Amino acid sequence: LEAAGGIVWRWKAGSDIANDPAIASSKSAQEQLDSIEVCIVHRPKYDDWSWPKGKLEQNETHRHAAVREIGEETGSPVKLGPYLCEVEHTLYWMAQPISADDAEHLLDAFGPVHRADVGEINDIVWVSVREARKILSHSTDKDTLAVFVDRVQEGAATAQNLLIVRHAKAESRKSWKGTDANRPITPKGAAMAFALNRELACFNPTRLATSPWLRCQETLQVLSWQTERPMEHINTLTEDAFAEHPAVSWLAFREQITQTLNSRETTAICMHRPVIGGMYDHLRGLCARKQLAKQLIAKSPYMPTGTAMSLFIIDTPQGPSIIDIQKVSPI
Amino acid sequence: LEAAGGIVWRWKAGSDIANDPAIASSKSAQEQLDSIEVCIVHRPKYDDWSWPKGKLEQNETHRHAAVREIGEETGSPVKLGPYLCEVEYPLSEEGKKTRHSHDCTADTKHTLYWMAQPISADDAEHLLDAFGPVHRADVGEINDIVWVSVREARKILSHSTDKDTLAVFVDRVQEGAATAQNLLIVRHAKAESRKSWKGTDANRPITPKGAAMAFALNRELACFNPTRLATSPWLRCQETLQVLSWQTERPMEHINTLTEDAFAEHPAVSWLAFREQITQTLNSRETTAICMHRPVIGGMYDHLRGLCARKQLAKQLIAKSPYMPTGTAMSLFIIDTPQGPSIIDIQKVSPI
Numbered sequence: 001l002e003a004a005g006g007i008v009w010r011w012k013a014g015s016d017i018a019n020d021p022a023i024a025s026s027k028s029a030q031e032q033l034d035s036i037e038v039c040i041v042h043r044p045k046y047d048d049w050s051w052p053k054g055k056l057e058q059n060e061t062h063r064h065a066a067v068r069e070i071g072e073e074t075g076s077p078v079k080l081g082p083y084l085c086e087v088e089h090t091l092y093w094m095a096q097p098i099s100a101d102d103a104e105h106l107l108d109a110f111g112p113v114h115r116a117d118v119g120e121i122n123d124i125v126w127v128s129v130r131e132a133r134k135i136l137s138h139s140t141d142k143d144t145l146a147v148f149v150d151r152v153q154e155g156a157a158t159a160q161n162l163l164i165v166r167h168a169k170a171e172s173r174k175s176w177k178g179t180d181a182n183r184p185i186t187p188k189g190a191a192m193a194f195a196l197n198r199e200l201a202c203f204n205p206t207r208l209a210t211s212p213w214l215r216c217q218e219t220l221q222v223l224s225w226q227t228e229r230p231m232e233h234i235n236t237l238t239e240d241a242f243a244e245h246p247a248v249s250w251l252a253f254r255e256q257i258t259q260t261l262n263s264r265e266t267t268a269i270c271m272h273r274p275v276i277g278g279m280y281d282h283l284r285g286l287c288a289r290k291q292l293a294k295q296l297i298a299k300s301p302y303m304p305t306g307t308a309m310s311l312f313i314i315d316t317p318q319g320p321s322i323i324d325i326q327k328v329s330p331i
Numbered sequence: 332l333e334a335a336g337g338i339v340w341r342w343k344a345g346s347d348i349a350n351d352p353a354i355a356s357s358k359s360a361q362e363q364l365d366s367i368e369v370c371i372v373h374r375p376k377y378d379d380w381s382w383p384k385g386k387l388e389q390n391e392t393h394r395h396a397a398v399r400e401i402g403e404e405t406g407s408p409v410k411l412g413p414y415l416c417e418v419e420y421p422l423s424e425e426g427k428k429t430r431h432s433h434d435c436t437a438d439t440k441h442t443l444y445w446m447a448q449p450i451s452a453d454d455a456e457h458l459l460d461a462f463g464p465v466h467r468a469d470v471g472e473i474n475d476i477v478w479v480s481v482r483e484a485r486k487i488l489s490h491s492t493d494k495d496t497l498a499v500f501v502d503r504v505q506e507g508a509a510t511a512q513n514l515l516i517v518r519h520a521k522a523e524s525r526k527s528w529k530g531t532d533a534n535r536p537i538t539p540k541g542a543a544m545a546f547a548l549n550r551e552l553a554c555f556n557p558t559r560l561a562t563s564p565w566l567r568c569q570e571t572l573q574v575l576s577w578q579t580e581r582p583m584e585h586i587n588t589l590t591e592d593a594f595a596e597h598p599a600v601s602w603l604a605f606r607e608q609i610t611q612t613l614n615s616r617e618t619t620a621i622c623m624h625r626p627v628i629g630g631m632y633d634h635l636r637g638l639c640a641r642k643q644l645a646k647q648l649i650a651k652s653p654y655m656p657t658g659t660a661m662s663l664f665i666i667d668t669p670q671g672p673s674i675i676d677i678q679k680v681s682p683i
Contacts, residue, residue, distance in 0.1 A: 057529075058527065107534075108534065108536065111529075111530065112529055112530035112531075112534070114529065175389065177463075177466065178463065178464035182459070182460060182464070184460065187543035187544070187546045187547040187682070187683075188543055190542050190545075191539035191540055191542050191543035191546075192539070193542075194539045194542035195539040195542075214460065218574075221574075221577055222542075222570075222573065222574070225573060225577065331539060
């Protein structure tokens with residue numbers, strides 16, 4: 001029996017960090033943790049308090065089930081943050097509430113979410129991390145909360161989200177009688193790209209970018225259409241541009257990371273494999289852990305075509321540091 | 332073996348019909364034919380004159396090859412019109428004036444022909460990604476392109492095979508084909524089952540496989556130069572044509588009165604909305620692509636069926652498999668009459 005859910009958190013209204021989130025990283029882990037409220041729901045069935053979660057629907061992923069279950073039980077649409085853990089079978093993510101307007105832009109991309117009935121949930125509360133430890137009914141949830149605290153101590157509360165998307169399956173260079181720039185994705189590629197939208201939607205992507213080359217454009221265009229977020233073309237990220245000026249490519253990419261951190265919005269960018277490889281050559285060594293760096297590979301099966309990697313980043317004096325990596329596959 | 336091509340035609344410059352195509356239908360068949368010009372190409376290898384045509388590429392439809400080959404050899408991009416015929420003759424025959432059948436062992440060539448009309452450079456540019464690339468033939472393949480009257484075509488065509496096809500073009504014209512306009516009806520792609528979808532019927536989307544289906548269909552629909560796009564506002568229909576809309580930059584016009592609910596409630600209103608599209612298609616002389624729900628299509632067909640020019644055509648006008656499977660389309664060529672729109676040709680359009 002598969003289920004998914006998570007710990008939805010926010011900065012306590014009135015706290016210094018809430019008044020200006022940008023100062024979060026200039027605060028200690030304790031100052032941050034003391035400024036956080038987490039969401040706990042009450043199930044009348046067992047008269048218990050726990051983290052919102054629920055069973056996956058038929059052919060639905062755990063990440064999608066998690067966002068849906070949180071919305072159904074807390075009434076809050078959210079975007080997934082770093083992954084927390086799994087319990088013997090439920091997977092948990094820490095997550096942040098998104099605006100009602102943003103949620104509306106994801107209606108078709110994510111799919112429907114129905115409010116739970118009073119017989120499923122009859123109370124929703126927002127408490128501090130200390131109180132959460134006190135009121136949670138099951139030890140399992142307290143453990144997950146402890147993992148949540150670890151993440152915060154490791155800077156997760158200040159992390160921002162960058163989604164890197166490899167273009168979907170495209171026509172072979174062998175049979176394509178056009179230019180490489182207009183080489184399109186194949187019918188199967190369109191299916192993969194289409195199916196991937198519901199997954200990418202779990203991270204509330206509100207800034208879309210892409211190499212101008214058709215195969216990359218077509219990979220995110222339906223998402224762009226449903227979310228009404230125009231795709232920004234980044235000419236300096238084509239394979240030709242990367243081959244000629246790789247450092248200029250890093251600047252282009254790095255600027256998107258800067259925009260992501262400043263706006264605190266999720267950025268999704270469709271890129272070419274060798275270009276992603278070049279980006280990773282610099283990000284690998286900046287990862288928070290060796291385990292993360294080992295996964296940061298722009299090749300299959302680490303990252304097959306039509307799939308993405310949801311990266312959570314904090315900036316450091318040495319460069320952007322990835323604190324978590326989630327491989328995102330369609331269907 | 333497999334090839335495709337066609338007779339690309341236009342109204343002679345300076346002629347009355349040319350100065351105002353709208354008057355074409357008020358002219359006799361003989362008046363139309365005498366004011367028409369058809370395109371013939373010269374091949375240096377055979378030093379012959381024939382209709383443009385060429386071998387289908389791997390995984391290409393005959394219809395797509397027809398448009399591409401015409402484009403490669405005549406240099407002008409076109410939109411397919413009514414279908415003409417198919418021919419077959421031994422490969423050894425090709426340079427001979429009169430094509431003769433051979434025995435079972437001989438290698439043969441099978442060619443499908445359509446009548447077609449040139450489209451503007453701008454429209455062609457809008458179809459670049461939807462149709463795909465088209466390069467020009469080299470002087471070693473084609474080294475002259477002429478436009479002649481139907482009478483002269485009969486006199487300069489090097490092969491009997493092409494003269495037979497021209498006779499079919501004549502038959503088609505004599506039946507209104509030169510005045511016909513193109514409406515493409517598109518059934519939405521495979522969609523989520525009503526039982527598993529937990530949203531509204533309005534928002535039920537197509538499946539990833541449906542999306543592949545719709546995407547592949549684009550290069551086929553592109554053969555008819557669709558410049559007007561319409562759809563039921565329901566998501567499953569919108570998503571069936573949105574990639575085409577995106578590529579061609581032609582907005583998708585929502586027609587609320589064509590949803591399944593609207594049709595069930597007011598079927599006559601559905602016909603009016605549908606008929607208004609036919610009116611627009613005929614007046615603009617542009618191809619309209621409209622995505623609809625199966626039952627609503629059946630409802631349109633119940634009226635169109637009896638107006639078909641041939642009973643053979645009426646029998647094919649069925650809104651359901653195997654006649655019209657999900658995710659496929661029907662390209663209709665229509666001429667309007669005092670009793671209502673009359674279909675003179677039907678072409679089933681499927682992907683892959």
